[PDB]
Amino acid sequence: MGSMRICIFMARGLEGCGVTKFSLEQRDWFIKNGHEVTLVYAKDKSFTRTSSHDHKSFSIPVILAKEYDKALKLVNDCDILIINSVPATSVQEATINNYKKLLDNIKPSIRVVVYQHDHSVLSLRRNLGLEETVRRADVIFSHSDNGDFNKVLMKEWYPEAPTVYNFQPPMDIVKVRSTYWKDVSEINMNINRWIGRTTTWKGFYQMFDFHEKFLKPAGKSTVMEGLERSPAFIAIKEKGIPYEYYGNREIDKMNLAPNQPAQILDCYINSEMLERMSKSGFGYQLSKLNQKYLQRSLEYTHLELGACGTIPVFWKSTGENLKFRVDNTPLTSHDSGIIWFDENDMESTFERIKELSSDRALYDREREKAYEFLYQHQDSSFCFKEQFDIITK
Amino acid sequence: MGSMRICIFMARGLEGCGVTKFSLEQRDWFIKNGHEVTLVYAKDKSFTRTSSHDHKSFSIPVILAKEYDKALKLVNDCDILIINSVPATSVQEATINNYKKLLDNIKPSIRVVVYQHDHSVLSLRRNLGLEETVRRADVIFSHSDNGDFNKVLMKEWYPAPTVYNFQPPMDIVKVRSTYWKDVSEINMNINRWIGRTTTWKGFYQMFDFHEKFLKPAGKSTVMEGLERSPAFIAIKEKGIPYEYYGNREIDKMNLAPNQPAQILDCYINSEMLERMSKSGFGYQLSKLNQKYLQRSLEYTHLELGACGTIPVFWKSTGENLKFRVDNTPLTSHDSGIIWFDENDMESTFERIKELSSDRALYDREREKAYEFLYQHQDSSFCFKEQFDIITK
DNA sequence: GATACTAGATAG
DNA sequence: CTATCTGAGTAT
Ligand SMILES: O=c1ccn([C@@H]2O[C@H](COP(=O)(O)OP(=O)(O)O)[C@@H](O)[C@H]2O)c(=O)[nH]1
Ligand SMILES: O=c1ccn([C@@H]2O[C@H](COP(=O)(O)OP(=O)(O)O)[C@@H](O)[C@H]2O)c(=O)[nH]1
Ligand SMILES: [Cl-]
Numbered sequence: 001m002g003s004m005r006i007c008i009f010m011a012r013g014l015e016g017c018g019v020t021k022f023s024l025e026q027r028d029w030f031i032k033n034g035h036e037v038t039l040v041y042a043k044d045k046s047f048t049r050t051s052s053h054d055h056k057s058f059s060i061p062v063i064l065a066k067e068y069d070k071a072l073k074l075v076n077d078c079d080i081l082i083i084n085s086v087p088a089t090s091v092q093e094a095t096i097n098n099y100k101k102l103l104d105n106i107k108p109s110i111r112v113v114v115y116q117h118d119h120s121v122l123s124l125r126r127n128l129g130l131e132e133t134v135r136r137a138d139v140i141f142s143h144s145d146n147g148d149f150n151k152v153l154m155k156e157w158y159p160e161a162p163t164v165y166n167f168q169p170p171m172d173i174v175k176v177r178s179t180y181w182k183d184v185s186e187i188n189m190n191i192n193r194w195i196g197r198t199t200t201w202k203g204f205y206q207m208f209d210f211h212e213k214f215l216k217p218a219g220k221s222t223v224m225e226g227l228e229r230s231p232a233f234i235a236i237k238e239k240g241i242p243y244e245y246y247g248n249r250e251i252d253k254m255n256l257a258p259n260q261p262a263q264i265l266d267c268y269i270n271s272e273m274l275e276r277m278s279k280s281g282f283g284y285q286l287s288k289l290n291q292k293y294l295q296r297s298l299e300y301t302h303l304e305l306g307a308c309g310t311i312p313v314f315w316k317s318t319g320e321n322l323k324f325r326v327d328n329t330p331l332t333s334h335d336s337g338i339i340w341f342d343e344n345d346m347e348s349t350f351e352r353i354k355e356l357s358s359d360r361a362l363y364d365r366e367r368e369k370a371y372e373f374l375y376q377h378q379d380s381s382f383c384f385k386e387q388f389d390i391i392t393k
Numbered sequence: 394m395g396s397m398r399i400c401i402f403m404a405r406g407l408e409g410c411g412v413t414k415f416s417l418e419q420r421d422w423f424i425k426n427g428h429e430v431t432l433v434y435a436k437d438k439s440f441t442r443t444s445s446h447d448h449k450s451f452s453i454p455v456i457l458a459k460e461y462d463k464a465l466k467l468v469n470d471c472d473i474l475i476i477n478s479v480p481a482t483s484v485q486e487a488t489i490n491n492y493k494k495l496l497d498n499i500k501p502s503i504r505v506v507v508y509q510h511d512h513s514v515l516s517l518r519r520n521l522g523l524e525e526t527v528r529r530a531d532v533i534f535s536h537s538d539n540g541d542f543n544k545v546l547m548k549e550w551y552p553a554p555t556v557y558n559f560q561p562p563m564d565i566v567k568v569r570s571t572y573w574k575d576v577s578e579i580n581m582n583i584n585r586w587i588g589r590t591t592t593w594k595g596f597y598q599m600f601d602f603h604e605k606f607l608k609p610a611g612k613s614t615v616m617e618g619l620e621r622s623p624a625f626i627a628i629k630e631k632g633i634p635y636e637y638y639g640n641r642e643i644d645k646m647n648l649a650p651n652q653p654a655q656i657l658d659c660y661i662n663s664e665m666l667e668r669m670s671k672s673g674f675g676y677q678l679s680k681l682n683q684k685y686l687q688r689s690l691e692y693t694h695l696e697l698g699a700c701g702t703i704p705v706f707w708k709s710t711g712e713n714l715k716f717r718v719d720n721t722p723l724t725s726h727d728s729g730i731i732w733f734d735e736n737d738m739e740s741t742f743e744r745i746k747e748l749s750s751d752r753a754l755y756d757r758e759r760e761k762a763y764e765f766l767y768q769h770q771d772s773s774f775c776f777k778e779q780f781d782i783i784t785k
Numbered sequence: 786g787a788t789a790c791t792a793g794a795t796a797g
Numbered sequence: 798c799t800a801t802c803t804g805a806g807t808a809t
């Protein structure tokens with residue numbers, strides 16, 4: 001096949017999280033493969049993390065609620081329209097109304113591709129127009145065959161077509177490495193860095209646990225990145241938990257020294273973090289996702305850890321519930337390097353951390369296999385090729 | 394008596410229901426009679442209806458688990474400590490535990506009054522540390538001499554002491570002078586039911602009614618209070634037609650005739666009484682068993698006749714509930730209330746037309762409602778009755 | 786069964 | 798925490 005013009009549409013806005021990251025990585029790949037790519041997003045709703053990713057140079061903001069004409073032209077200008085998000089249940093009638101409008105005036109030639117990115121129904125039920133989007137769509141992707149998308153909504157709308165293929169949010173792992181990788185001689189093995197967001201399932205509570213019980217009592221330092229301000233702290237606070245908060249402006253005032261509680265950081269720049277991470281001894285990404293929602297998809301923050309040369313420390317459960325991209329075997333059942341964080345036998349998890357904190361050689365060996373495991377499981381070189389073939393089939 | 398400091402303590406935390414209403418009504422009566430009051434409540438467990446009543450401006454929350462000092466400072470600062478509830482069984486050790494340490498460190502000079510607002514044994518067991526409290530109480534109330542508390546549990550702990558009876562008093566008078574609209578704004582066709590998602594709050598019976606009569610006759614029905622708690626899976630599974638509006642969408646309530654019953658979950662007490670004082674009729678069929686019934690009505694009951702609407706109470710009930718004055722079955726009076734009979738549901742719909750036609754006969758029946766209820770459970774009569782027992 | 790009475794997950 | 802959502806469990 002030849003070259004096609006792809007329009008990557010984010011109708012929910014640019015949230016600066018997985019959906020933004022995915023859109024971006026998706027952009028870089030079509031481009032890297034000889035394809036014209038525009039990236040449109042609804043500016044109608046504004047988001048906190050609108051600067052975590054570098055995109056202000058090519059993203060094309062539009063305001064459904066007024067610039068309908070502008071939007072209508074953009075979307076109708078391509079061979080493939082990829083929809084990664086839809087308006088949120090908080091936008092004004094105009095916005096949503098005009099978005100439903102766009103779905104009706106797409107040249108029937110164009111090939112609409114919907115990517116459902118959320119898992120739980122609590123999330124899906126916060127969308128507006130998702131049905132008009134799915135109906136008009138020609139190809140549909142989701143994270144799990146057993147997720148609330150394929151199982152709940154999909155059968156709701158269609159009491160009985162169409163085929164919802166599977167996908168994994170790819171990342172050009174090779175590139176992040178050749179940009180942030182470091183020499184083990186430069187990695188403070190004492191810095192334990194967790195990244196995610198103030199959402200119970202990303203597993204920030206457990207990080208706190210693992211610090212007050214093993215990390216801190218060993219002279220180690222813990223930095224928890226990405227916890228936006230939220231009432232969820234109300235809980236954290238008088239739940240009896242010490243920590244120190246830093247605005248992304250106070251990042252240089254963190255106490256990365258011993259016998260110090262959890263150093264927090266509300267929001268961050270992908271790149272800035274990767275850098276910080278690359279010189280970190282152990283990154284922790286502890287999403288404890290429900291098994292109904294897991295299949296082949298690791299989150300971007302899983303990919304970034306192994307990507308920049310730090311020992312990945314993911315949630316044991318998740319590794320058990322995810323199947324490798326090649327042989328389709330469990331993740332936990334591989335010599336990846338991945339220190340599987342054991343919520344129960346934590347002590348055991350801490351032992352493997354100390355075993356590598358002192359053996360620099362072992363380290364490199366563990367992170368090399370980890371880099372390669374993940375690279376093999378969900379790198380953009382494979383995942384987008386697997387998807388593109390589905391779309392163009 | 395004179396002037397004393399009162400500390401109304403809600404150990405289970407603010408549940409926003411009757412027990413939460415009782416405390417506020419109690420606080421209002423004490424203050425009104427000039428007694429310094431402070432309303433403490435254990436934050437160790439949050440409940441959804443924490444907005445039903447306004448209290449955010451005075452109530453004082455406490456974390457029994459991490460702020461024990463603060464707690465003990467609060468209960469020992471008063472002459473009479475009133476405990477209306479205890480911690481739940483779902484709480485963590487540090488709570489139930491510190492709650493007890495409290496009970497044991499309460500000055501011996503403070504008079505501890507305990508109000509047991511529960512009925513069944515289930516309920517009388519879904520609480521922790523009750524025994525420690527009852528044992529510490531200088532005074533103990535309950536809703537019925539023939540309940541599970543006096544019979545089952547009391548005899549259990551004490552095979553000494555006395556358990557006086559009481560009623561949950563409300564300022565019927567204060568709620569009139571604010572919501573009691575003019576019979577020229579009372580949309581006779583509206584039928585509002587109050588209570589919550591539990592079989593004995595007669596909600597199943599409502600639906601039936603809006604079906605065998607209300608819906609037919611072109612009327613409309615709204616039932617406020619139905620929370621989508623697990624008890625709701627019963628409504629859905631029994632397949633009943635209803636439309637569910639929250640409080641941000643109370644407006645979009647299709648009020649027009651020929652409609653299913655309009656359900657509204659956890660509502661505001663001030664808003665409810667409002668609409669209810671502009672509504673044709675107020676239903677409340679608390680079909681509570683008799684053993685638990687003795688003289689106590691529910692605030693949902695006393696709030697209907699209070700906002701000048703036509704009170705529809707579950708017949709069975711009024712028959713077991715004795716009148717505060719002569720102690721005679723309620724129902725045998727000219728209460729001005731419709732004794733909703735699940736059996737002769739039509740007869741009930743009759744007295745409803747009979748009174749929803751003559752907009753002059755309606756205004757004269759609700760005037761018997763208010764007075765009869767005022768004489769049975771008003772703050773001035775009851776809290777004076779309770780203050781005496783407490784101070785004896 | 787009949788009948789009566791009664792919370793874990795997650796997004797913002 | 799507060800809000801929207803979903804679909805049994807308990808006891809006799
Ligand atoms: O404050 C933040 C939060 C997240 N991210 C990045 O946004 C992506 C989020 O992807 P993932 O799917 O792991 O997170 P989720 O979208 O599920 O929140 C990752 O590249 C993060 O490093 C960021 O740059 N700053
Ligand atoms: O969603 C609700 C439910 C109830 N109530 C009020 O809470 C009290 C409940 O008293 P009652 O004893 O009738 O009910 P229960 O205590 O059994 O919940 C009454 O004043 C109701 O008006 C309220 O404000 N909002
Ligand atoms: Cl994603």
